[PDB]
Scaffold this active site. Structure first.
Site, PDB file in Angstrom:
ATOM      1  N   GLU A 263       0.764  -1.337   0.390  1.00 42.49           N
ATOM      2  CA  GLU A 263      -0.134   0.267   0.340  1.00 42.49           C
ATOM      3  C   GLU A 263       0.819   1.583  -0.131  1.00 42.49           C
ATOM      4  OE1 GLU A 263       0.283  -2.197   2.330  1.00 42.49           O
ATOM      5  OE2 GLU A 263       0.355  -1.037   3.996  1.00 42.49           O
TER       6      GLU A 263
ATOM      7  N   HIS B 160      -7.869  -3.938  -1.245  1.00 38.88           N
ATOM      8  CA  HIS B 160      -6.915  -4.697  -0.085  1.00 38.88           C
ATOM      9  C   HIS B 160      -6.393  -3.322   0.534  1.00 38.88           C
ATOM     10  CE1 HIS B 160      -5.362  -6.819   3.878  1.00 38.88           C
ATOM     11  NE2 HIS B 160      -4.198  -5.349   2.989  1.00 38.88           N
ATOM     12  N   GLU B 161      -5.102  -3.033  -1.047  1.00 38.44           N
ATOM     13  CA  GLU B 161      -4.023  -1.847  -0.269  1.00 38.44           C
ATOM     14  C   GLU B 161      -5.141  -0.547  -0.681  1.00 38.44           C
ATOM     15  OE1 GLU B 161      -1.991  -3.411   0.146  1.00 38.44           O
ATOM     16  OE2 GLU B 161      -2.016  -5.501  -0.431  1.00 38.44           O
TER      17      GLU B 161
ATOM     18  N   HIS C 244      -5.810   0.111   3.034  1.00 40.25           N
ATOM     19  CA  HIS C 244      -4.920   0.409   3.803  1.00 40.25           C
ATOM     20  C   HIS C 244      -4.719   2.436   4.153  1.00 40.25           C
ATOM     21  CE1 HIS C 244      -2.755  -2.710   5.716  1.00 40.25           C
ATOM     22  NE2 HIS C 244      -2.687  -3.619   4.233  1.00 40.25           N
TER      23      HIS C 244
ATOM     24  N   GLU D 296      -3.830  -5.111   9.744  1.00 41.74           N
ATOM     25  CA  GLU D 296      -4.429  -5.725   8.623  1.00 41.74           C
ATOM     26  C   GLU D 296      -5.434  -6.234   8.981  1.00 41.74           C
ATOM     27  OE1 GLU D 296      -2.682  -6.150   5.850  1.00 41.74           O
ATOM     28  OE2 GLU D 296      -0.788  -5.591   5.989  1.00 41.74           O
TER      29      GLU D 296
ATOM     30  N   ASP E 199      10.565 -10.241   9.560  1.00 37.09           N
ATOM     31  CA  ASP E 199       9.628 -11.084   7.887  1.00 37.09           C
ATOM     32  C   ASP E 199      10.172 -12.934   8.537  1.00 37.09           C
ATOM     33  OD1 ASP E 199      10.457  -9.412   6.642  1.00 37.09           O
ATOM     34  OD2 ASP E 199      12.340  -9.546   5.942  1.00 37.09           O
TER      35      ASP E 199
ATOM     36  N   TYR F 158      -3.947 -11.000  10.195  1.00 34.96           N
ATOM     37  CA  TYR F 158      -5.645 -11.259   9.165  1.00 34.96           C
ATOM     38  C   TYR F 158      -6.449 -11.954   9.169  1.00 34.96           C
ATOM     39  CZ  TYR F 158      -1.230  -9.330   5.969  1.00 34.96           C
ATOM     40  OH  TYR F 158      -0.188  -8.763   5.343  1.00 34.96           O
TER      41      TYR F 158
HETATM   42  C1  LIG Z   1      -5.366  -9.003   0.056  1.00 33.60           C
HETATM   43  C2  LIG Z   1      -4.214  -9.575   0.960  1.00 33.60           C
HETATM   44  C3  LIG Z   1      -4.368  -9.962   2.307  1.00 33.60           C
HETATM   45  C4  LIG Z   1      -2.692  -8.700   0.297  1.00 33.60           C
HETATM   46  C5  LIG Z   1      -1.268  -9.166   1.219  1.00 33.60           C
HETATM   47  N1  LIG Z   1      -1.163  -8.201   1.076  1.00 33.60           N
HETATM   48  C6  LIG Z   1      -1.285  -7.434   1.757  1.00 33.60           C
HETATM   49  O1  LIG Z   1      -1.651  -7.321   3.137  1.00 33.60           O
HETATM   50  C7  LIG Z   1      -0.308  -5.438   2.226  1.00 33.60           C
HETATM   51  O2  LIG Z   1      -1.052  -5.212   2.650  1.00 33.60           O
HETATM   52  C8  LIG Z   1       1.222  -5.849   2.520  1.00 33.60           C
HETATM   53  N2  LIG Z   1       2.080  -4.199   2.906  1.00 33.60           N
HETATM   54  C9  LIG Z   1       2.315  -7.241   2.420  1.00 33.60           C
HETATM   55  C10 LIG Z   1       3.304  -6.695   3.701  1.00 33.60           C
HETATM   56  C11 LIG Z   1       3.351  -7.168   4.575  1.00 33.60           C
HETATM   57  C12 LIG Z   1       4.168  -7.243   5.794  1.00 33.60           C
HETATM   58  C13 LIG Z   1       4.935  -6.295   5.465  1.00 33.60           C
HETATM   59  C14 LIG Z   1       5.600  -6.578   4.316  1.00 33.60           C
HETATM   60  C15 LIG Z   1       4.130  -6.655   3.687  1.00 33.60           C
HETATM   61  C16 LIG Z   1      -0.331 -10.142   0.340  1.00 33.60           C
HETATM   62  O3  LIG Z   1      -0.737 -11.483  -0.134  1.00 33.60           O
HETATM   63  O4  LIG Z   1       0.751  -9.352  -0.491  1.00 33.60           O
HETATM   64  O1  LIG Z   2       6.082  -7.207   8.571  1.00 32.23           O
HETATM   65  C1  LIG Z   2       5.163  -7.433   9.829  1.00 32.23           C
HETATM   66  C2  LIG Z   2       4.699  -6.935  10.906  1.00 32.23           C
HETATM   67  C3  LIG Z   2       4.441  -7.530  11.746  1.00 32.23           C
HETATM   68  C4  LIG Z   2       4.675  -8.588  11.895  1.00 32.23           C
HETATM   69  C5  LIG Z   2       3.753  -9.599  12.728  1.00 32.23           C
HETATM   70  C6  LIG Z   2       2.717 -10.239  12.469  1.00 32.23           C
HETATM   71  C7  LIG Z   2       2.515 -11.342  13.492  1.00 32.23           C
HETATM   72  C8  LIG Z   2       1.187 -10.767  14.335  1.00 32.23           C
HETATM   73  C9  LIG Z   2       0.454 -12.337  15.007  1.00 32.23           C
HETATM   74  O2  LIG Z   2      -0.892 -11.691  15.896  1.00 32.23           O
HETATM   75  C10 LIG Z   2       1.209 -12.762  14.955  1.00 32.23           C
HETATM   76  C11 LIG Z   2       1.833 -13.469  13.572  1.00 32.23           C
HETATM   77  O3  LIG Z   2       2.234 -14.978  13.468  1.00 32.23           O
HETATM   78  C12 LIG Z   2       2.044 -12.937  13.741  1.00 32.23           C
HETATM   79  C13 LIG Z   2       5.339  -9.683  10.998  1.00 32.23           C
HETATM   80  C14 LIG Z   2       5.898  -9.166   9.809  1.00 32.23           C
HETATM   81 ZN   LIG Z   3      -2.148  -5.221   3.463  1.00 34.04          ZN
END
Ligand SMILES: CC(C)C[C@H](NC(=O)[C@@H](O)[C@H](N)Cc1ccccc1)C(=O)O
Ligand SMILES: Oc1ccc(CCc2cc(O)cc(O)c2)cc1
Ligand SMILES: [Zn+2]
Ligand SMILES: [Yb+3]
Ligand SMILES: [Yb+3]
Ligand SMILES: [Yb+3]
EC number: 3.3.2.6
Length: 607
Positions: free
Chosen positions: A268, A292-293, A296, A315, A372, A380
């Site tokens: 996003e 979704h994006e 955000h 998320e 990561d 989510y």
């Molecule tokens: C519909 C969504 C669940 C799609 C999902 N994308 C996202 O959630 C993006 O908004 C996230 N910003 C992707 C992300 C999260 C943590 C660190 C780096 C990148 C994806 O699968 O990339």
């Molecule tokens: O870029 C990011 C930012 C935050 C996280 C941590 C994300 C997370 C949250 C949570 O309640 C359960 C998980 O298993 C993982 C991971 C990657």
């Molecule tokens: Zn997202």
């Protein structure tokens, strides 16, 4: 406290603005330049401060036109190296100064992927893209690399003149580079304060096509036409998002369709969402990623999680709005279908992790944990499930969308925690507090495993998927003849995907069943990436050797981690493909995205 950052916290000092002047050198694979941070002291008598860095070379640090003393601390693994700067004059509370840091990145910057001409569509020019979330901005420039701090930014970026630079900001013009006529300087302004994880840069042979009143799509020339069609619903989604969230404050909403190694489905980045070319299904069926994006732009970019422990705020609320956008476009039954699919993905995650694992909690503790590595579907889908349960508890979607809009208004331009959220929830619904006290807050927010309560789901669109999957699972050899292409007659691509997700949950199936499924449904011909992903997974887990080259090809020809990681892991788990799987990773590793390379290696227990 932000345990993912080594910088001075927001209580000590705050970056108000960044002015970035840099040059992209494709020969050396370096970004070189100056980051000028406007920093406001939050303390009396402030004499030093600390910034995050990661694999950066610092040349000098200038304040009031003079060089000053600084020191790079020892590296702390994935957090990088803390940089202490000695201020020449002690600062009083609220005083602001400008610190100009001359730096250069490493070719191994974990924020960046440098692509040769062969790794692109056009085959003539190189290409560079950034990915800062969560804690990779420090691998581009020295900053307080924490979303507890919001800053505006401006940037001037010099690139070879036949290429185009774009950033998460409004385009502010281009000129020949006065110091080098083989180059252009592109300028950018982001007037809305943002967390530094939202800083983004792409440099490549990019072309654009307008697809709505505030949206261009950007890609290499060979993807422009298909992307324009794939994402044509973008303006209609923005309008619904504005209706639910309030004013879109960012000016433009452009899209960038990256090369296939982009590690995420979407990101996003403000003014310029980045997406995977794996969305290009040809029928707009994967457009929820756009919804979704877009969402955000309110939940995450305007109201931001204060640390990454509270990522579910970002998320979960975004998936909540995403599903409403798609429910408005395609109906309430479709919203429920996708909501229930998400509960299914949460089942998978909790099963994989294990029901007592710390990372199945909604609020986690990332101390000493690389985000990561901790990244999953939990924030989510367990976040969304909490919201969906609360919607149902508090009187339905109209009522809960009232809270969501008020919540966005309340916390715009701020960074907040779970308690901030919960506190406002209670304030907003003060006439329903007795109902709110019926929620098991400790379990939902702080306990591992599946949530204590499952929401209620309409089953209309799901029933046929479950029915067909159960037919296959309970089929014996003598039942295989009864299956036929007509079984799929009335299923949408979404239902075909959910059929495969259901069946994958019970994998392996007998090899003869899987061969029959290819025989009658020809799933091998489907190029929808979600569908193909789950199908190849089912094939490999059911030990079908034919699918080995298909799974390898998909794992390597694109690099969306959602697909590439489980395909390599499945291939390594299958005895017949294990040795090829590690060999293929080994062979591709140098040219992979740095984060993807790292995670696949850990997944495979290689290097
Ligand atoms: C519909 C969504 C669940 C799609 C999902 N994308 C996202 O959630 C993006 O908004 C996230 N910003 C992707 C992300 C999260 C943590 C660190 C780096 C990148 C994806 O699968 O990339
Ligand atoms: O870029 C990011 C930012 C935050 C996280 C941590 C994300 C997370 C949250 C949570 O309640 C359960 C998980 O298993 C993982 C991971 C990657
Ligand atoms: Zn997202
Ligand atoms: Yb201008
Ligand atoms: Yb309260
Ligand atoms: Yb039988």
């Amino acid at each position: 406290v932000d345990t993912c950052s080594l910088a001075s916290p927001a209580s000590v000092c705050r970056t108000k603005h960044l002015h970035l002047r840099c040059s992209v050198d494709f020969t050396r694979r370096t970004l070189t330049g100056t980051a000028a941070l406007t920093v406001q002291s939050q303390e009396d008598n402030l004499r030093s401060l600390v910034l995050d860095t990661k694999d950066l070379t610092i040349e000098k640090v200038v304040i009031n036109g003079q060089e000053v003393k600084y020191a790079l601390g020892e590296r702390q693994s994935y957090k990088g190296s803390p940089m202490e700067i000695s201020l020449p004059i002690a600062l009083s509370k609220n005083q602001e100064i400008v610190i100009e840091i001359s730096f250069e990145t490493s070719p191994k910057s974990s924020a960046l992927q440098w692509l040769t001409p062969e790794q692109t569509s056009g085959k003539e020019h190189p290409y560079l893209f950034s990915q800062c979330q969560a804690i990779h901005c420090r691998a581009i420039l020295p900053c307080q690399d924490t979303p507890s701090v919001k800053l505006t930014y401006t940037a001037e970026v010099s690139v070879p003149k036949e290429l185009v630079a774009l950033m998460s900001a409004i385009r502010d013009g281009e000129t020949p580079d006065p110091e080098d006529p083989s180059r252009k300087i592109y300028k950018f302004i982001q007037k809305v304060p943002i967390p530094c994880y939202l800083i983004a840069l792409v440099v490549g042979a990019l072309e654009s096509r307008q697809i709505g009143p505030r949206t261009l799509v950007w890609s290499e020339k060979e993807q422009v036409e298909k992307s324009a069609y794939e994402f044509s619903e973008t303006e209609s989604m923005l309008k619904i998002a504005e209706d639910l969230g309030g004013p879109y404050v960012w000016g433009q909403y452009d899209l960038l369709v990256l090369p296939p190694s982009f590690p995420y489905g979407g990101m996003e980045n403000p003014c310029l969402t980045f997406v995977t070319p794996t969305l290009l299904a040809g029928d707009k069926s994967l457009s929820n990623v756009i919804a979704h994006e877009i969402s955000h732009s309110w939940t995450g970019n305007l109201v931001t999680n204060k640390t990454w422990d509270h990522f579910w705020l970002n998320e979960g609320h975004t998936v909540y709005l995403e599903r409403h956008i798609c429910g408005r476009l395609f109906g309430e039954k479709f919203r429920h279908f996708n909501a229930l699919g998400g509960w299914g993905e949460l089942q998978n995650s909790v099963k994989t992790f294990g029901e007592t694992h710390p990372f199945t909690k909604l609020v986690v503790d990332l101390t000493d944990i690389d985000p990561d590595v901790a990244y999953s579907s939990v924030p989510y889908e367990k976040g969304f499930a909490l919201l969906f349960y609360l919607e149902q508890l508090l009187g339905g979607p109209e009522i809960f969308l009232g809270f969501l809009k008020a919540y966005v208004e309340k916390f715009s331009y701020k960074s907040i925690t779970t308690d901030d959220w919960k506190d406002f929830l209670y304030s907003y619904f003060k006439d329903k507090v007795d109902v709110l006290n019926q929620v098991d807050w400790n379990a939902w927010l702080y306990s591992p495993g599946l949530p204590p309560i499952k929401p209620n789901y309409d089953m209309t669109l799901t029933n046929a998927c479950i029915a067909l999957s159960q037919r296959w699972i309970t089929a014996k050899e003598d039942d295989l003849n009864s299956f036929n292409a007509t079984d799929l007659k009335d299923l949408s691509s979404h239902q075909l995907n959910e059929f495969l997700a259901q069946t994958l949950q019970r994998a392996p199936l007998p090899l003869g069943h899987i061969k029959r499924m290819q025989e009658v449904y020809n799933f091998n011909a489907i190029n929808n990436s979600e569908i193909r992903f789950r199908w190849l997974r089912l094939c490999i887990q059911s030990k079908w050797e034919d699918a080995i080259p298909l799974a390898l090809k998909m794992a390597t020809e694109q690099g969306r981690m959602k697909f590439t990681r489980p395909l390599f892991k499945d291939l390594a788990a299958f005895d017949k493909s294990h040795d090829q799987a590690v060999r293929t990773y080994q062979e591709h590793k140098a040219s992979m995205h740095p984060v993807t390379a790292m995670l696949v290696g850990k997944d495979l227990k290689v290097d």
